[PDB]
Design a protein around this ligand. Structure first.
Ligand SMILES: CC(C)C[C@H](N)C(=O)NS(=O)(=O)OC[C@H]1O[C@@H](n2ccc(=O)n(C)c2=O)[C@H](O)[C@@H]1O
Ligand SMILES: [Mg+2]
Ligand SMILES: [Zn+2]
Length: 834
């Protein structure tokens, strides 16, 4: 054994050893219990930085923990390769996005392989390859035929200068980002997944996810946004029918989730495009301009709420009050009825609207004896659970649910309204007017219409010999791509030139890893049956809503097609915290050392301030194990992690110390058979070290397996080494216990720092580390030894309580013979019955 720790020497040798034994290349091995650990696969956008490395280290720690415990572990890796990053670089560097993407993949694969992650590279996928994306084209065509995917006009942000469609993120103050030209809203045909048909399933199945963080489930429930409420109709007054046709001449219909407060409605509000808004605005120039301002305008709660009165009235069907209709900019045409009622005394938005315009407020709910103040909003005004109806005539005294049913009763009997369930969830628009994405497998025929490509003609292949220029999608300018023949009639036709939302690839990639070479389907039945669901998913909170909901949606779509048999894709979910670092100017922290540049503020590792720390720089300086160790030790995985030059150094020193501990141990006599069995006759000090050892094994196992807090696992091993360092292990029985401690220490740490622990393990023991397996707890090592006047002595467990001593004291042969018909308890010394 070499004396000094040389990571640049041992790490490639250890990685070579693991690849040769194919430890991480796995099959559907029925002889071993499966474990599917998955980290969110990256966009191949450049270099990974320490932030990404934290994510993949965590996955590797859990994977290797399960490996050592005998599982058949699949830890797959892959490339989320479509999307905007490459198209910017395609414009930026005058390079094909494909060429730039594949180049990126190679740099990052070697980056990852150098960190020593236990990854099945034979299951690697790149989502920009036709062998991948053909299967999401296939699913598209199957769902299109069933109407689960449909085509429909939607409105988009058109920039007339750049001549491209803009995302709302790129629409600042009404104008485009790279142009500052006023955005034109355009109606164009687009494709949608009917995700609203699955809203109830997506919502209720969250309850199954007992090993998901509660806030993730809460964000999903709120995004879906189910409500059980009331459709309510307000008769238009005789004086207000002016201009209205059809059912709009008869009644104004709203949706409300507080029908229990209908007796406190003091005005109503309609969207700019509502027919009432149009009829009122006919001879009223002020309303015309307000309608116009609304049409041009996420930012809902942020925007100043505005309205104008219309002079039109509707009648409350419960109390007969004539209420004025307002046009308001917060009422959106396309959600529910495009009109709402307003209850300023019990809804905070209505309260502010009403306090702005001096509109009436009517208290119709009281909460205990809390007093009502029409000039100050108070949280209890909105109380749905502890309030009870006041000023509501007949309804006076009911609670929310009974008044709901009473109002539903009354309304239905008048024909004036019915209960209704609504969802905030919109359908999922997947059309993108971008080149670097999966082609939509539709052909447009002037005779047959929009027709799906037949399955045997899939994939529709995206040409990779393209350099976009940002002045439109190149596919719409590429005759050799879009000219084709109709699959239904043989006539001349045109391919769809929009590509798919690149969330589509990340919505099923975890199934493709089960059989990434399968050519007869998205995923083979044999492999989906074996791998089941992802046991453990690790990724950033930024994907807690859309990506996770889409992946759950796709799972249920695929189950309903018969391709998988689970309802939910991810059993456990771990949300690793951000990684932050000081900034400098914008100079990368590897171009800087400190005691001329400006040492600015600490913030998330990103390209914005060029403060991403390149893991390759960190490997070249200290080795992979030091990088892994620093990030697993610096903070619990969920907490944010501050980059620290001294933290990295102190991780490295720990690895030197661990190296030197095994070396000095082996210099003083070479390896011995590790202590095992009965420890009676061991000295107190070696008993205490064995106690620390097996306590440490139980804690690390709990920290890896239950708590997933790796930083405290490492601290516990350092404690063991500390007690080892103060224990005389020179004797024969001492060396056997030292061997036991070191064989367990290097195994306990192997998931965190596998290169050094693989190397040290082999100097200690000739067996293969993964066959020796995860260290076991020796419970016998966890048992400590047993411990008026005076008349009796008793033997007590070392963990005996003060009532166990008083128990055995009161029942002693010398006590009872001196009792003749207070009990001061000194633990470990004496007990006296006075
Ligand atoms: C499933 C699909 C939609 C994932 C998508 N390709 C993505 O976000 N791709 S990605 O390439 O952006 O990120 C890959 C993973 O790395 C994590 N990450 C990234 C930067 C960072 O600072 N920190 C601290 C950090 O943890 C990030 O949360 C994610 O799970
Ligand atoms: Mg369960
Ligand atoms: Zn045709």
């Amino acid at each position: 054994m070499q004396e000094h720790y040389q990571p640049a020497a041992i790490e490639p040798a250890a990685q070579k050893k693991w690849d040769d034994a194919r430890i991480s290349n796995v099959s559907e091995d029925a002889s071993k219990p499966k474990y599917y650990c998955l980290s969110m696969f990256p966009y191949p956008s450049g270099k990974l930085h320490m932030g990404h490395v934290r994510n993949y280290t965590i996955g590797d720690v859990l994977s290797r923990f399960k490996l050592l415990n005998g599982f058949n572990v699949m830890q797959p890796m892959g490339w989320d390769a479509f999307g905007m990053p490459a198209e910017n670089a395609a414009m930026k560097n005058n390079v094909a996005p494909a060429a730039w993407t594949y180049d990126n993949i190679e740099y990052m694969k070697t980056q990852l392989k150098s960190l020593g992650f236990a990854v099945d590279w034979e299951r690697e996928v790149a989502t920009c390859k036709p062998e991948y994306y053909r299967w999401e084209q296939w699913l598209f065509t199957k769902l299109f035929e069933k109407g689960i995917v449909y085509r429909k006009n939607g409105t988009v942000n058109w920039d007339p200068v750049d001549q491209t469609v803009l995302a709302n993120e790129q629409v600042i103050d009404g104008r485009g980002w790279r142009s500052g030209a006023l955005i034109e809203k355009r109606e164009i045909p687009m494709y949608y997944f009917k995700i609203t048909d699955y809203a109830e399933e997506l919502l209720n199945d969250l309850d199954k996810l007992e090993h998901w963080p509660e806030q993730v489930k809460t964000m999903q429930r709120n995004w879906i946004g189910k409500s059980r409420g009331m459709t309510v109709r307000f008769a238009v007054s005789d004086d207000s029918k002016q201009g209205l046709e059809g059912d709009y001449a008869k009644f104004l219909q709203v949706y409300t989730t507080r029908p229990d407060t209908l007796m406190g409605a003091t005005y109503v509000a309609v969207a700019a495009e509502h027919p009432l808004a149009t009829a009122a605005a006919a001879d009223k120039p002020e309303l015309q301009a307000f309608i116009a301002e609304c049409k041009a305008g996420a930012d809902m709660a942020t925007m100043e709420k505005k309205g104008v009165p219309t002079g039109r009235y509707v009648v409350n069907p419960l109390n007969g009050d004539k209420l004025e209709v307002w046009i308001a900019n917060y009422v959106l045409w396309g959600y529910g009825d495009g009109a709402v009622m307003a209850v300023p005394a019990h809804d905070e938005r209505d309260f502010e609207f009403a306090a702005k315009y001096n509109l009436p407020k009517k208290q119709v709910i009281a909460v205990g004896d809390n007093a009502f103040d029409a000039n100050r909003w108070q949280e209890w005004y909105g109380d749905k659970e502890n309030g009870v109806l006041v000023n509501s005539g007949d309804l006076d005294g009911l609670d929310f649910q009974t008044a709901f049913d009473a109002v539903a009763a009354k309304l239905q009997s008048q024909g004036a309204g019915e209960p209704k369930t609504q969802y905030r969830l919109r359908d999922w628009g997947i059309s993108r007017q971008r080149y670097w994405g999966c082609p939509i497998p539709i052909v447009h025929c002037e005779k047959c219409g929009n027709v799906p490509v037949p399955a045997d003609q899939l994939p529709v292949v995206l040409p990779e010999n393209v350099v976009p220029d940002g002045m439109g999608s190149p596919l719409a300018k590429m005759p050799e791509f879009y000219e084709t023949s109709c699959p239904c009639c043989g006539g001349a036709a045109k391919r769809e030139t929009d590509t798919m939302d690149t969330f589509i690839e990340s919505s099923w990639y975890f199934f493709r890893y089960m059989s990434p070479k399968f050519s007869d389907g998205m995923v083979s039945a044999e492999s989906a049956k074996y791998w089941g669901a992802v046991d453990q998913y690790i990724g950033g909170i930024e994907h807690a809503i859309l990506h996770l909901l889409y992946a759950r949606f796709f799972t249920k779509l695929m189950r309903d097609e018969g391709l998988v048999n689970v309802d939910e894709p991810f059993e456990r979910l771990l949300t690793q915290g951000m990684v932050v670092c000081e900034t400098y100017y914008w100079i990368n922290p590897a171009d800087v050392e400190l005691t001329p540049v400006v040492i600015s503020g600490t913030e998330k590792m990103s390209k914005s301030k060029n403060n991403g720390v390149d893991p390759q720089e960190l490997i070249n300086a200290y080795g992979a194990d030091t990088a892994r160790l620093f990030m697993m030790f610096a903070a619990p995985p969920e907490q944010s992690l501050e980059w620290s030059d001294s933290g990295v150094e102190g991780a490295h020193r720990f690895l030197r110390r661990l190296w030197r501990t095994v070396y000095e141990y082996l210099k003083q006599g070479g390896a011995v058979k590790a202590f095992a069995g009965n420890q009676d006759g061991l000295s107190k000090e070696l008993k205490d070290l064995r106690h620390k050892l097996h306590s440490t094994t139980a804690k690390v196992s709990d920290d890896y397996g239950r708590r997933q807090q790796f930083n405290t696992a490492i601290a516990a091993v350092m404690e063991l080494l500390n007690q080892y360092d103060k224990t005389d292990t020179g004797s024969e029985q001492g060396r056997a216990v030292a061997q036991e401690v070191l064989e367990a220490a290097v195994r306990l740490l192997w998931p965190i720092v596998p290169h050094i622990c693989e190397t040290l393990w082999s100097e200690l023991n000739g067996a293969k580390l993964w066959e020796a397996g995860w260290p076991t707890v020796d419970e016998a090592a966890l048992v400590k030894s047993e411990i008026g006047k005076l008349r009796g002595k008793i033997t007590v467990a070392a963990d005996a309580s003060k009532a166990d001593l008083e128990a055995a004291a009161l029942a002693n042969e010398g006590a009872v013979k001196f009792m003749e018909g207070k009990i001061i308890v000194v633990p470990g010394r004496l007990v006296n019955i006075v």
